[PDB]
């Protein structure tokens, strides 16, 4: 649903 | 290392708007540029939130939920601070290459939205808010709303929120005032935190309208488009529990 936000939270910075 | 210094070190970098000053001004141009910049501010807000001690311990769903509710509270407050540090103003320092001045405020429909942002910088100025107090307050704004049924990690959230409420208290004691004024300042600062809910509600009225009315040709980036798409139904179904310090 909220693809971009989930990606940004799940990925390593 | 103190909890406040950990919030200080993760302060996001100043982003530029990419606004070509040689071409004349217009409301549509400025509003479009600010939406595009807003998406980049929000992408940096995810990176910011993830580095806040305790935030990454909440359920992934709660992390998404908190950023989705607070997005406008975080951006209005951070802008208010940035504009207050470049005061006496009367100006909104969105980016170093795009400052909304008195002449830019005269542009059609510009003031109506800018005035809610100007209220924030005017309040931080009136109350002479410090850097430490500001940092504590901005983190508390990320934790200012929850869903109607609550969060998956509600107990842990309430524990994290209480921790940052106490952090704000430490920044108030540092101003070297007697306990009567220490109670007064906390009452004053948490009243500004409570009043952010209204600032956001006022800003979101025009923001939701520009997003939904496709005939206005006002573009939003994927990041902002995604937040608005998620938030509109939640405000419609009353799925929001706004936390208040004063009743
Ligand atoms: C004309 O007045 C406005 C007011 C708000 C907005 C957008 O919201 C922001 C808020 C803050 C923003 C940005 C970009 N940058 N900063 C920022 C800058 C510095 C800082 F420290 C923090 C944030 C975007 C909003 C999504 N769109 C609307 O409301 C549209 C209907 C107009 C655009 N124009």
Beta bridge partners of B238: none
Q: Are B53 and B129 in contact (CB under 8 A)?
A: no
Q: Are residues B50 and A3, on separate chains, in Cβ contact within 8 Å?
A: no
Give the span between the Cα atoms of B86 and B185, in whole angstroms: 23
Nearest chain A residue to B51 by CA distance is: A13
Angle between helices B222-236 and A3-10 (to 10 degrees): 110
Q: What is the resolution of this structure in A?
A: 2.4
For chain A, percent helix, then strand, then coil, each to nearest 5? 60, 0, 40
User: Which residues contact residue B100 at a Cβ distance below 8 angstroms, ignoring those fewer than 6 apart?
Assistant: B30, B91, B92, B94, B110, B114
Q: Which fold has domain B1-247?
A: Retinoid X Receptor (1.10.565)
Beta strand spans in B113-163 (E) = 145-146
**CA distance linking residue B37 with residue B99, whole number of Å:** 13
For B1-61, give the secondary structure using H, E and C. Answer: CCHHHHHHHCCCCCCCCCCCCCCCCCHHHHHHHHHHHHHHHHHHHHHHHHCCCCHHHCCHH
Say how far apart CA B60 and CA B158 lie, in whole Å: 16
> Which pairs with CB-CB distance under 8 Å and at least 24 residues apart come from B187-195?
B187/B246, B188/B127, B189/B127, B189/B129, B189/B133, B189/B137, B190/B245, B190/B246, B191/B245, B191/B246, B192/B123, B192/B124, B192/B127, B192/B137, B193/B137, B193/B140, B193/B141, B193/B144, B193/B245, B194/B244, B194/B245, B194/B246, B195/B123
Whether residue B19 is preceded by a cis peptide bond, meaning omega within 30 degrees of 0, is: no
Residues 6+ apart with CB under 8 A from B83: B89, B91, B92, B93, B117, B118, B120, B121
Match 């998406």 to its residue by tokens.
B39
Quickly tell me which residue has 């100025």 as its tokens: B125
What's the rounded Cα separation, in Å, for the pair B78 and B230? Answer: 23
What residues have CB less than 8 Å from B85, skipping those under 6 apart?
A: none
CA B197 to chain centre: 10
Cβ neighbours around B159 below 10 Å, total = 12
Burial class of B85 by CB neighbour count within 10 A (0 to 12, 13 to 18, 19+): middle
Which residues of chain A have a CB within 8 Å of the CB of B47?
8, 13
Non-local (6+) Cβ contacts of B216 within 8 A are B210
* CA angle, B5 then B7 then B12, to 5°: 120
Only one residue has tokens 């419609």, namely B236
| Experimental determination approach used | X-ray
Q: Which of B48, B57, B31 is nearest to B221 (CA)?
A: B31
Q: How far is the CA of B42 from the centre of ligand 1 (A)?
A: 10
Rounded Cα distance between B43 and B218, Å, is 20
Spacing, Cα B30 to ligand 1 middle (Å) = 10
Among B50, B63, B226, beta carbon nearest to A13: B50
Under DSSP, the state recorded for B149 is: T
Ligand 1, atom 11, lies closest to the CA of B75
Rounded CA separation B235/B241 (Å) = 10
CA distance B2 to B170: 11
Which of B13, B63, B231, B140 is closest to A5 using CA atoms?
Answer: B63
**How do the domains of chain B map onto residue ranges?**
1-247
């Amino acid at each position: 649903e909220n693809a971009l936000l989930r990606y940004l939270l799940d990925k390593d910075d | 290392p103190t909890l406040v210094s950990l919030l200080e070190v993760i302060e996001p970098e100043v982003l530029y708007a990419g606004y070509d000053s040689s071409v004349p001004d217009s409301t549509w141009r400025i509003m479009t540029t600010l939406n595009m910049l807003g998406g980049r501010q929000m992408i940096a807000a995810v990176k910011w939130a993830k580095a806040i001690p305790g935030f990454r311990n909440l359920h992934l769903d709660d992390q998404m939920t908190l950023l989705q509710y607070s997005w406008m509270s975080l951006m209005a407050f951070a802008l208010g601070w940035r504009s207050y540090r470049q005061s006496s103003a009367n100006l909104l320092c969105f980016a170093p290459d795009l400052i909304i001045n008195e002449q830019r405020m005269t542009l059609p429909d510009m003031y109506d939205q800018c005035k809610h942002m100007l209220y924030v910088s005017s309040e931080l100025h009136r109350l002479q808010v410090s850097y430490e107090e500001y940092l504590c307050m901005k983190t508390l704004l990320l934790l200012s709303s929850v869903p109607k049924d609550g969060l998956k990690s509600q107990e842990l959230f309430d524990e994290i929120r209480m921790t940052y409420i106490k952090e704000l208290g430490k920044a108030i004691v540092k101003r070297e005032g007697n306990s009567s004024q220490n109670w007064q300042r906390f009452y004053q600062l948490t009243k500004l935190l409570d009043s952010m809910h209204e600032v956001v509600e006022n800003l979101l009225n025009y923001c939701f309208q520009t997003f939904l009315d496709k005939t206005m040709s006002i573009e939003f980036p994927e990041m902002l488009a995604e937040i608005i798409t998620n938030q509109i139904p939640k405000y419609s179904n009353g799925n929001i529990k706004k936390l208040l310090f004063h009743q």
